[model samples]
Target: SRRSRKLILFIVFLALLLDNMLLTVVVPIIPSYLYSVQVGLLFASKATVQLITNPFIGLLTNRIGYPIPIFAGFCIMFVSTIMFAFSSSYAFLLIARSLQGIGSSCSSVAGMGMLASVYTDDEERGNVMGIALGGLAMGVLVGPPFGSVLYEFVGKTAPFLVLAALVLLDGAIQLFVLQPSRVQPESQKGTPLTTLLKDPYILIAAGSICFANMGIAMLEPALPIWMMETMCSRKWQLGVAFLPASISYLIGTNIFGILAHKMGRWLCALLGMIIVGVSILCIPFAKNIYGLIAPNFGVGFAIGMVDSSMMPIMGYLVDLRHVSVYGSVYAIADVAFCMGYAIGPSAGGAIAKAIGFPWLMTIIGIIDILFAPLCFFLRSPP
Candidate 1:
């Protein structure tokens, strides 16, 4: 049983690692890959497709089952990686990114669904999800540097080919080894899917995650531009800049996950929000690595806290609502996250272009601070 459980967790972690690694591995090379100003478009394109795919993937998972979507996600991602490797035009790159997003949506929802089915214990669920989140953070840590170094030394397409190989291996594991956890059909469920959406706590939780992620997304496009203009950072250095944040994210997920179990998810969520707001407020003032590292790490730590706290609670809510609907329930959070990602970069770029980075950061920080109060409204676990 322990072996089975470890195998399941490994599958979950590997799935998430591959997904995130693919998502961010292109970041360090964005300026060379496409126009610098279009960085936001690259991120937004992925999020837009992911947003569209979330609901569809949810319904598919509900109908067929989790493993099918998981396998499909891997296949789609593999194709997307090939596309990215060979993409000659900006248009093709956008298409490749969108396909990646579709793969992400499918993989993400089903992966969480599997976790929900297997880990019924709340604390165990939180810890395992935190570990999974750590896997994602590890990707963030490795991806950018890998992209820059391989692209520099080997070839432009080298990094993507490497990623594709990793995905191929992951697909083999999924096909041969990983089995989906059983799910009860909707006929055995107590409440309709529509009714569950009306719950205030669900809305609150969804809103919190969306807003928090929006704050982070705002930085993705803007940060590189800031680094280029302010510090004249190189590609490898740009990748290294994310190292502090990624490491902190990995650490914070494990630490705050335990704290969330011992304390309260609502409290941890609220605290994370406040930290994010404060960290964003400090960003505009950061002119160098010395000045920026603390804030970046803070933002990542807050992200880990919020994510580790919120996701397990969401999973618990789905479990309470109906184990059969984990796909549908987690889809809500996925959609919210994607929507934020889609909107944040586009709006952030526009705002930073219209005003300036300093004012933009201030406004974004203020918006997050305003959102902090909503955490008080969240209901504790039933």
Candidate 2:
């Protein structure tokens, strides 16, 4: 059990890191390829399909167990990356991005299932998941900069190929280290999808993540052009400029993960929600690149708080209110994340077009704050 635990943790880390890196790496290079609607679609495509796939993937995982879906998801992602690397034309881009999302759902649901199963201690879950989630944060931390630098120095294809190579290396380790039977130590039966869906606490947690994710993602499609005009952005600033938020996200997750048990999960979430809302309000006021530093950090750190706090809560909910199995629980988390990510970018295009970017930030920031009170209702399981 101890030996397998170590491997499980590493696999989750590697897979999540790779997944998020691939998602954001394209952010820097995208404006060169497409305009507003297309850029929004390109960013939304992955999560759009992912949100649809997550519930079914959860059901599949609960029925067939975790290992097969996990492995299959990895293979699907590898193919999608390769397709993305070679494909030209906007038509092919959407297909590849959709495939990436589907792959992300299958693996991410099972990966979290795997992590929660291995570390069962109620007292320790927050810290453990925080560290595991750090990979997700770290991927976001470096993805933009890496993509920008690689694209500038080498070629457009360089970052994608680099990610592909890194994924392959992680896959090779997965082959040797992953054990189906060991990972699937328990029975497959789980709570009904409807049962979990009907639960109030689940909705609260889902909404928390959905709202927080939307706050950051809405900026992706609209920020680049504005930054160029307003901030006098250099060639690489489109990607590298957002490092402040991602860096703070990493810090927020780690710090909250350690303090969650002591601080109260909902309380941490409440703090995060307020900060996220305020940060969005602050985003458009930045007159220079350096001026963006404050709001970006606020957005990043508060998101980390919501993300890190709620994730472990999902795990505990399975153990406390529902079934003992984890597949479905993690699937719900996937659904929430994908929904927010999908909607944020898609709407960002339309909102920025209609009202303009500053007002876009102002309105969305208000929307985020409107949902802030929901965190008060979320309580960790005893």
Candidate 3:
């Protein structure tokens, strides 16, 4: 049983890591390779689709089932990534990316449902979930450097093509190997939309994830931009700022997951938030590239904390019989992430343009501080 669970989680880990790795690889190069005068509008469109689609995808799983949508998501992502590899114009690239967003949002949330079906008890699910998330963090940790090297060897879009191949393999695996049980119907099965809004925990978790993602969203695209725009560095120098956070995330996810078992989820999430705020505070003051390392790593650590704990917390509040519906909560978090990704860069770009990078960093730091307390309201721990 343990071996079977590990195998399932391993499949999920490699699947998600491949997806994130491909997407993030393009981060440093996107300005030149992808950005146009209308790039901001392109980003806005992609985020809007993600925001609109993810929650409903989760709800659809509650009504229909998981495998069909999951398989469809894989297919769409694979095709979109391949399309992204060939696109020369910004408009085609934007359309491809938006479709990719929809696909990933489905795959990501549905995978959690798939995992939940695999593990029966709290401990195994928590640990495996943490392990899977750690893999994602590990992807973030390793993907950029891997992307940077690939850019040197093959070209800008090579990573996406490689990832697309991986997703195709995953679809094949899921098609035959993933034999899921029937989803149970909810108690309020035919209830009106207004009645579903009565779930207070869902509301709180949604709001918290928005702030949580606002912090995480600040890192990837913005971190690279800071290196090029502010540090005036070569492409290789991008790794200097990004790698520290990656390692920190790996440590945070694994450590926080185990610690959440012992110390309690509330404490773990709260502590993680504090560390992130401190990291953000450090960012505005850094004079050199080396100075950026610790803060970024701290961001990873904080992300590890919130992420490691939040899923299980949601699981507790949800109706266990209707696991599919409960599973949809993950989509809510990603939808928050979609909003934050849209908000963070565009706002940061505006602020950095108007005042300066330093002041903008300070403002982001202050906003980061506000998120630490919201964790207490959301957790009771296991």
Candidate 4:
């Protein structure tokens, strides 16, 4: 019976992988889609919208249901993708991306909420979450760059169109494969939103997710810039900078998933933070692409460890009866993360312009390292 459950879990993992693939496929060709400044604004505006809507969406999940919003998300996202093909101006791109933001927000929350539906026990829950989310991570590692290649072969609109089709496909697969949770009432049927917040662990998990994402966001924009500037390379060479991150994360998330079963989520998270600290700390010393790759790869590894370990463990910290509410709480972390990404670029860019990219990296490294001790707050398996 557990084996059958694990098989279903593997399918769930595939769904998350496809979900993320569709979501991230647009990233690489963003500059080609619009002028440079507009691209930044387009993404930034979406991040801002996500930051605003993410929290509210969580409450909505607790009120309405998972499938309704998830359905709405795909519909909006599909429409947004179609709209992107027609957009020629910055304003249109801004609005289009923002719509996608709403959809992405919904998908992010609902996906986690749905994952809770797949498990029957704490160990199974953690294992399934880790396995499925690891697939999500692998999709991310491959998606953007793969889209870039496709865009290069076709055109900008092709990637969006393909992603739209892929999203629809994912929805279709989800329909056939997944069943509604037996443990929790289907949808937000019983618990009021107020009672969900009364729980402390959910809030703390959300907070930790936000801070961790903030660190990730702050460093991300400046990273490629650091590579290009330090190496005196052409802009397209930016793609070269991304490889270490991709490879490291794929390897790291899978390894971390296995380690989670043994070490406990808290210890896994601490190890992840330490790895992040080491990666970030070494950034200032990088003088070339070769120099930068190791640290960036380490950052990816750390992200894999923390995320793969942390995401699945949420099922254990609470009553399974309120999985949607718990999943909604997970969305609060996404909001924090989007805010971090939004604030990260502008702040990092400004700081880099004033001080230097390396210096900014130094600060990010220091700040991220501090999260290590925060892991101590969590309990180990008894």
The TM-scores, one per candidate, come to 0.90, 0.90, 0.86, 0.84
Q: What ranges in model 1 sit over 4 Å off?
A: 1-3, 28-39, 179-193, 227-237, 321-324, 379-382
Candidate 3, after superposition: displacement of residue 127 in Å? 1.0
Q: What is the lDDT of residue 16 in candidate 4?
A: 56
lDDT of 3 by residue, 215-292 (tens): 766655566767676668787676676777667777877876667867777677777767777777788678678787
Candidate 4 global TM-score: 0.84
- Per-residue lDDT value at 32 in model 4: 58
User: How many residue pairs collide in each prediction?
Assistant: 0, 0, 0, 0
| Best-matching candidate per lDDT | 2
User: Which one wins by TM-score: 1 or 2?
Assistant: 2
Clashing pairs in 3: none
lDDT of each: 0.80, 0.81, 0.69, 0.68
Query: Residue 7 of candidate 1: its Cα lDDT?
Result: 72
* Error at 313, model 4, angstroms: 3.2
**Candidate ordering by TM-score (highest first):** 2, 1, 3, 4
Write one digit per residue (lDDT tens) for candidate 4, span 81-176. 778766777677788878878877876777666567656466666666666667756786778777777777877677778777776776665453
